[PDB]
Design a protein around this nucleic acid. Structure first.
Ligand SMILES: [Mg+2]
Ligand SMILES: [Mg+2]
Ligand SMILES: [Zn+2]
Ligand SMILES: [Zn+2]
Ligand SMILES: [Zn+2]
Lengths: 168, 112, 87, 559, 269, 96, 170
DNA sequence: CCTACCGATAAGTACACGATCCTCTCGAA
DNA sequence: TGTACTTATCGGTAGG
RNA sequence: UCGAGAGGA
């Protein structure tokens, strides 16, 4: 109203948009935390939503493995949604090639490990999406950490992530 | 007691020639002039100078005079009146437009 | 500020349908029928959409819900079925 | 609709807030510069200069252009520009409000004359009104002509404490046309012996005092923190209304014929250009003020040309200019003439006639009137055969159609059209058909004095050009047939026509709520003959007794 | 001026006459809350007449030989005689009827009985006697408990304001008063048998038709009332063709208010 | 024909809110205008082909709402802007 | 990186007022929302859970017969930030620099925003970027840090850099 | 017993208002 | 024709 | 089309 100040610049100092708040609201009414996803989390959510879409589209009609995931996702994208959607195919193409964990079992422990340490869901969405080797690598690429997490305690998590890491 | 005398005077003119108008109409006009504190004139400065939406008031003589006061005092027209919805060109909240109507999906299936 | 609507229990509004509601419910149902909307009552060779909307009310097959507002903003949603047509 | 689809949400205007234009926002809002006061031709070849008229705003002659958004005359909403005033000037409407704010808040510092510590000041500020609170604030600070520094002596033991800045004497201000003058006293055995000193108070002085006015002094005098700051009552940057507000009209093709405001807008630019060059070039001190009063007067008569009994301003020829106040002034002027009451389509008017064989709710509409007025019917499975048969009859055979609107917005004029004879007619299409029998329509007789006089009437298409009506319905309208005329309004929607038959019907309005008795009675021959017939003296023989019975439309058939 | 002053005024859904801003002018439209069209000029028989005729026409005395109801009117006219429990309510009936006469004389001090009120009881009983073809020879099927209780049970059903709390309930009782005063006047235990001769079948129909016509006579929320009043006063002023000021020149003073003479002749008693 | 104040007055008295509105819009003025939801003025530059709806003064291509209001009202609010008055048309409620 | 957000949107023609309405409206929702790209929310990628969609009631409009329904839904969004480090794939390879297809958005890196000790190789098709044993070609996954964001139409664009510690080719 | 102030009733000056709609014709600098 | 707004002279109140 | 003038229930 009446121009307003604008807020602040969108930065990597956890200065997210004036819309994407750390603690936001729900359609039901509850004060639910921000829902940020990594590349393994976001890949299993679109596949789940499109697997359950064809199940609902054909209900009304009544009355694992690396390269095998590439071709099965490509078929699912053509049936559930029409050719008009170009963005979704490029995203699902990019998500399956860059996912860190394929199995839904491993992802659950990854989220329990990260969403617990005391880090913003965006920092978790960035840790679970980018592969990091050194503690300093994660502290530089995700600069919101530094004081938020201990250098040796962050390395403890980074080691466990290589154990949780899936085979491609 | 003043409003009771006011009705006697208003009714006495309607009774003078052309009987009659139902109590309800004159008692409404009388109650309008007295549900204020004292007496309210039915003129440009009496009734028209009230805590009413600027658009409703400007449509009776003092038009630009009132619209300048509206801007200078930062008045807000509530859009709850008869006149301000006629100017805006919307179904005014009068008889037919005083209630909204929605469609019930629970009922839509029930009737097929 | 929060909601303001009183439930379908404890209502201080007239159980009867106001003459303005009757004319509006017919007006909008006759308009929708005229705009190819699906007719719920069994048609008896009716070429006029108002003749359809008038029968639609007699059988009580209109899926409309009236929102009767009060001066404080509060409203009570009365389904056409709940209201009695005396007039 | 304003033609063509939009990919933006459509939502009712729930409330309208009023305020003042900030000269800082008028610079950001603006798309135009308006340097040249000329309007038509390039410099000067053809089609409007980039100064006044279409620099980057409203289009002109059949050209879509409109600063690259195009759209055309019927879609282009007109864009606002700005004109920088060389010296700030007062707004005609806020003359006494500026003068009364100066009479309340002291000068030299920009702080209130009376603040909190005075008992009456607390008694006046007690109301959380807007104008009624400021009304007391004016009478309280009107007097006590000097600002204060130390004041409390009977709330704290004896010594006084300071709450204000400078204690300079505020003067008495009066009106001498467009300018205000203050009278400083002093004269206590010092300068000017006994007579007071008078100063001309310029807008540049007043504006800087209003800029120094505190955030709480706005709320105390009936002003808003973001909509109506007292600094915006004085104009530093004036907005220019686009061509839809002041059209070119177009005199034939190569001629002009501009609007009264376009000439007036250029006259403010002409008054401003003299000062713009005088302030920079040779400045003759008491010769720029002589031109500043003319710029103040030009911006003043543009908004208000029917001002106090002193100046006038007329655009030669002798006829005076119509200002924005005079344009939207009451009685046939924008609010009462173009918004509260308007001219309408699908309407008729002809001499009225009486009929003893018409039903109380019936109206005899002539064949030429029903063939001219149309109702848009949507193609459904219930009409199709009827709707195609009317299209087949065309615009001359009585039950016919004039225009057929198809899937997209394309009118098919049946009066011409190569495919008029063909036409397949798909569902969802609209067919504008000639008015037909038993159609609910509003029939009215001006003056419209009571709830009646504007009633619904079943239509009956008849020959002989004149509005036929029933005799008993002469009372609600009041008119007789001594050369009287009556209006007619055909509703275009199925909802509005159902809001006429199930609400405003002639027999539905039989009993008057004004006198709780009926407003329709048997009159004239029907009242004169009913007395002659209803008496013990008269009886009717068998021959005429059976015709008397057959004339009754709901006769049981029992003699 | 009149029409522009009363535009905003409209009967809301809670039987209250408010406006645009929401200020209350009247709590019940025209004090009774009835659609002006469904009203007729009716006569209150409890206010008019002598006390001898009032006691003769309405007082019911089962504990007397000359002041009792004859068994040709009531089916059970002899077994109802000398009953103390049935006279308790017939005393309660007449004690409310004598209260009505004293309260009505306080309202209409001038003595006039004919006043405009909803539901034409006058005709509702006229049509019952023709619809059922009731004869004056044979006695009625109803008794005293059927009349006096049925009349009081109907008074509860005649709703204007939909109540729940102490304020709305008292405002409801205040809204009917003059109408149920006419109902007590017209449906008196003696009057029902002495003049009308109502059978229990036809009486139950008359009570329902009174309830039905009363709930029809209630104002419709959305009625523009002020706009209706503004025109209803302004229209007769147009036809004012007919040494104190009157007509339109006096009508300007009553609108203007307006501290000038014309004719300020005060009346002293 | 003219449907003035006296003609509008009777249609309010009857209660026919839509017939009065239809006479006032569909059979007369009726104009669709885009307004900036942030300030409430007709500052919107609506391109109905390239879809560059942007309001210069509020840097927004999201808070913009189209509205069907009479062409004379649009014209009136523009005359009020020419006299430094701001009739800010707000579609959001804030006072109950 | 990608978020799941709770957001809402519809005017429906009366001829579609039958039993097959709830599903027809759900289609009208994805017809416009699914594929869209708002400036405040980012790219609207996929409407999650086609079932359990909250539709409430449709207030039938004043003079027309259309119903205005509010459709509350849940969908995945792609919203970038100025500082957000992203690892996409090089799609366009040219003399000026390279374009990175990070999901549905293309990000451009200039020759100046990347190291000075790299340089473009014209005599190798598809076009390449050499240094020692690190080469940027038609595929080659690269780590980019988004320095700036461009709102433009319904397709967000960016201006990232790869000149820093742990950045460059991956 | 006088003065710094404080309410009286004045008289003068200024304010933009006044059926509804409709129809015809004349002549600009 | 009437109302409302705005300024000038004017008798007394009681406090130091 | 502006304005003036004229005319009508
Ligand atoms: Mg208000
Ligand atoms: Mg006549
Ligand atoms: Zn434009
Ligand atoms: Zn000061
Ligand atoms: Zn804006």
């Amino acid at each position: 109203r009446l121009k307003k100040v604008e807020e602040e610049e969108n930065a990597a100092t956890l200065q997210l948009g004036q819309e994407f708040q750390l603690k936001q609201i729900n359609h039901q009414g509850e004060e639910e935390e921000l829902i940020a996803l990594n590349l393994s989390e976001a890949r299993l959510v679109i596949k789940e939503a499109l697997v359950e879409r064809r199940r609902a589209f054909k209900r009304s009609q009544k009355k694992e493995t690396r390269e095998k995931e590439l071709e099965s996702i490509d078929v699912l994208l053509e049936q559930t949604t029409g050719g008009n959607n170009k963005d979704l195919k490029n995203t699902m193409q990019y998500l399956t090639n860059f996912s860190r964990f394929r199995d839904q079992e491993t992802v659950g422990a990854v989220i329990q490990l990260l969403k617990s340490t005391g880090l913003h869901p965006f920092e978790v969405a960035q840790l679970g999406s980018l592969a990091c080797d050194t503690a300093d690598e994660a502290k530089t690429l995700i600069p919101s950490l530094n004081n938020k997490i201990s250098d040796d305690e962050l390395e403890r998590i980074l080691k466990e992530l290589s154990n949780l890491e899936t085979l491609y | 007691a003043g409003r009771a005398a006011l009705y006697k005077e208003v009714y006495n003119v309607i009774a003078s020639d052309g009987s009659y108008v139902n109590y309800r109409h004159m008692a409404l006009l009388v109650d309008v002039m007295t549900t204020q504190g004292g007496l309210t004139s039915v003129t440009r400065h009496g009734f028209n100078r009230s805590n009413t939406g600027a658009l409703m008031r400007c449509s009776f003589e003092e038009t630009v005079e009132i619209l300048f006061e509206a801007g200078a005092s930062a008045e807000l027209d509530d859009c709850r009146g008869v006149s301000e919805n006629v100017i805006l060109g919307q179904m005014a909240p009068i008889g037919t437009g005083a209630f909204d109507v929605m469609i019930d999906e629970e009922s839509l299936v029930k009737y097929m | 500020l929060k909601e303001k609507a009183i439930p379908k229990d404890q209502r201080a509004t007239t159980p009867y349908m106001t003459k303005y509601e009757r004319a509006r419910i017919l007006g909008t149902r006759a308009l929708q029928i005229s705009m190819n909307a699906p007719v719920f009552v069994d048609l008896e060779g009716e070429t006029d959409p108002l003749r359809i909307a008038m029968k639609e009310l007699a059988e009580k097959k209109i899926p409309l819900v009236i929102r009767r507002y009060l001066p404080d903003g509060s409203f009570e949603d009365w389904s056409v079925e709940e209201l009695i047509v005396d007039l | 609709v304003g033609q063509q689809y939009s990919s933006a949400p459509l939502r009712t205007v729930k409330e309208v807030q009023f305020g003042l234009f900030s000269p800082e926002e008028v610079r950001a809002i603006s798309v135009a510069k308006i340097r040249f006061p000329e309007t038509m031709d390039e410099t000067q070849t053809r089609a409007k200069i980039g100064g006044l008229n279409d620099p980057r705003l409203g289009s002109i002659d059949r050209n879509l252009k409109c600063q690259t958004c195009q759209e055309g005359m019927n879609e282009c909403p007109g864009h606002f520009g700005h004109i920088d005033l060389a010296k700030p000037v007062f707004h005609v409407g806020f003359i006494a409000k500026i003068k009364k704010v100066c009479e309340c808040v002291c000068m030299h510092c920009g702080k209130l004359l009376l603040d909190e510590h005075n008992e009456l000041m607390r008694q006046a500020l007690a109301i959380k009104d807007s104008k009624k609170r400021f009304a007391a604030i004016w009478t309280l600070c009107k007097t006590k002509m000097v600002c204060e520094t130390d004041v409390p002596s009977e709330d704290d033991p004896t010594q006084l404490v300071s709450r204000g800045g400078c204690g300079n004497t505020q003067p008495t201000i009066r009106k001498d046309g467009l300018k205000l003058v203050g009278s400083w006293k002093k004269d206590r055995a010092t300068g000017d012996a006994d007579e007071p000193e008078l100063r001309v108070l310029s807008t540049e002085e007043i504006l800087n005092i209003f800029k120094h006015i505190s955030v709480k002094d706005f709320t105390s005098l009936g002003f808003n923190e973001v909509f109506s700051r007292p600094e915006w009552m004085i104009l530093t940057c004036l907005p220019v209304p686009p061509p839809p507000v002041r059209p070119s009209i177009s005199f034939n093709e190569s001629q002009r014929g501009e609007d009264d405001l376009t000439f007036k807008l250029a006259d403010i630019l002409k008054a401003n250009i003299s000062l713009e060059t005088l302030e920079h070039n040779g400045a003759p001190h008491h010769a720029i003020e002589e031109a500043e009063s003319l710029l103040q007067f030009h911006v003043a008569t543009y908004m208000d040309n029917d001002i106090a009994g002193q100046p006038q301003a007329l655009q030669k020829s002798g006829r005076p200019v119509k200002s924005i106040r005079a344009r939207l002034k009451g009685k046939e002027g924008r609010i009462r003439g173009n918004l509260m009451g308007k001219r309408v389509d699908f309407s008729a008017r002809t001499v009225i006639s009486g009929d003893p064989n018409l039903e109380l709710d019936q109206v005899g509409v002539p064949k030429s009137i029903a063939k001219t007025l149309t109702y848009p019917e949507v193609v459904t499975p219930y009409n199709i055969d009827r709707l195609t048969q009317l299209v087949r009859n065309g615009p001359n055979e009585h039950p016919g159609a004039k225009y057929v609107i198809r899937d997209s917005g394309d009118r098919i004029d049946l009066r011409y059209s190569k495919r008029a004879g063909d036409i397949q007619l798909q569902y969802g299409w609209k067919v504008e058909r000639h008015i037909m029998d038993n159609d609910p329509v509003l029939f009215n007789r001006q003056p419209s004095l009571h709830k009646m006089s504007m009633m619904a009437h079943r239509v009956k298409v008849i020959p002989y050009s004149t509005f036929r009506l029933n005799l008993s319905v002469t009372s609600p309208y009041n008119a007789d047939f001594d050369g009287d005329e009556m209006n007619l309004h055909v509703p275009q929607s199925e909802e509005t026509r159902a809001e006429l038959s199930q609400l405003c019907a002639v027999p539905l309005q039989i009993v008057s709520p004004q006198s709780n008795k009926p407003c329709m009675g048997i009159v004239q021959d029907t009242l004169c003959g009913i007395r002659k017939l209803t008496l013990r003296d008269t009886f009717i023989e068998l021959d005429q007794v059976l015709n008397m019975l057959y004339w009754v439309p709901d006769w049981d058939g029992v003699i | 001026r009149l029409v522009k002053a009363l535009e905003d005024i409209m009967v809301h859904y809670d039987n209250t006459t408010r406006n645009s801003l929401g200020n209350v002018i009247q709590f019940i439209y025209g004090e009774d809350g009835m659609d002006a069209a469904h009203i007729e000029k009716q006569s209150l028989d409890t206010i008019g007449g002598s006390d001898a005729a009032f006691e003769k026409r309405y007082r019911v005395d089962l504990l007397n030989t000359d002041h009792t109801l004859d068994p040709s009117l009531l089916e059970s006219g002899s077994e109802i005689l000398g009953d103390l429990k049935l006279q308790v309510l017939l005393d309660e009936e007449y004690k409310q009827l004598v209260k009505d006469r004293k309260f009505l004389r306080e309202v209409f001090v001038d003595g006039e009985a004919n006043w405009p009120l909803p539901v034409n009881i006058r005709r509702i009983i006229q049509n019952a006697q023709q619809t059922f073809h009731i004869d004056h020879t044979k006695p009625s099927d109803l008794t005293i408990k059927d009349i006096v209780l049925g009349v009081k049970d109907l008074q509860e059903n005649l709703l204007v304001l939909r109540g729940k709390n102490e304020i709305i309930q008292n405002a409801q009782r205040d809204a009917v008063t003059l109408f149920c005063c006419l109902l007590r006047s017209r449906l008196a235990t003696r009057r029902v048998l002495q003049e009308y001769r109502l059978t229990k079948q036809a009486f139950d129909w008359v009570l329902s038709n009174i309830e039905a016509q009363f709930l029809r006579s209630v104002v419709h929320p959305g009625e523009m009332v002020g706009v209706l009043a503004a025109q209803s006063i302004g229209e007769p002023a147009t036809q004012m063709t007919l040494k104190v000021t009157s007509g339109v020149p006096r009508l300007k003073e009553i609108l203007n208010v307006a501290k000038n003479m014309k004719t300020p002749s005060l009346t002293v008693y | 024909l003219r449907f003035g104040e006296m003609e509008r007055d009777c249609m309010i008295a009857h209660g026919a809110a839509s017939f009065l509105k239809e006479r006032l819009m569909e059979a007369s003025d009726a104009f669709r205008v885009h307004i900036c939801g942030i300030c409430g003025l007709m500052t919107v530059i609506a391109k109905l082909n390239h879809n560059q709806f942007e309001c210069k003064g509020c840097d927004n291509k999201i808070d913009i709402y189209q509205i069907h209001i009479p062409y004379a009202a649009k014209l009136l609010f523009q005359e009020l802007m020419a006299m430094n008055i701001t009739p800010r048309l707000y579609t959001d409620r804030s006072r109950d | 990186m990608f978020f799941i957000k709770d957001l809402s949107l519809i005017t429906l023609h009366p001829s579609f007022f039958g039993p097959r309405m709830k599903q027809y409206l759900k289609t009208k929702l994805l017809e416009e929302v699914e594929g869209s790209c708002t400036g405040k929310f980012g790219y609207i990628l996929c409407v999650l859970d086609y079932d359990n969609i909250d539709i409430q009631r449709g207030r039938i409009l004043p003079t027309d017969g259309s119903a205005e329904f509010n459709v509350k839904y849940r969908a995945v969004v792609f919203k970038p930030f100025k500082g957000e480090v992203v690892d996409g794939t090089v799609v366009s390879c040219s003399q000026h620099g390279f374009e990175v297809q990070v999901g549905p958005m293309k990000v451009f890196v200039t020759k100046h925003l990347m190291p000075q000790d790299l340089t473009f190789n014209a005599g190798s098709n598809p076009p390449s970027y050499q240094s020692s044993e690190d080469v940027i070609t038609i595929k080659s996954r690269i780590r980019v840090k988004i320095e700036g964001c461009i709102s433009q139409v319904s397709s967000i664009h960016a201006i990232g850099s790869i000149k820093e510690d742990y950045l460059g080719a991956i």
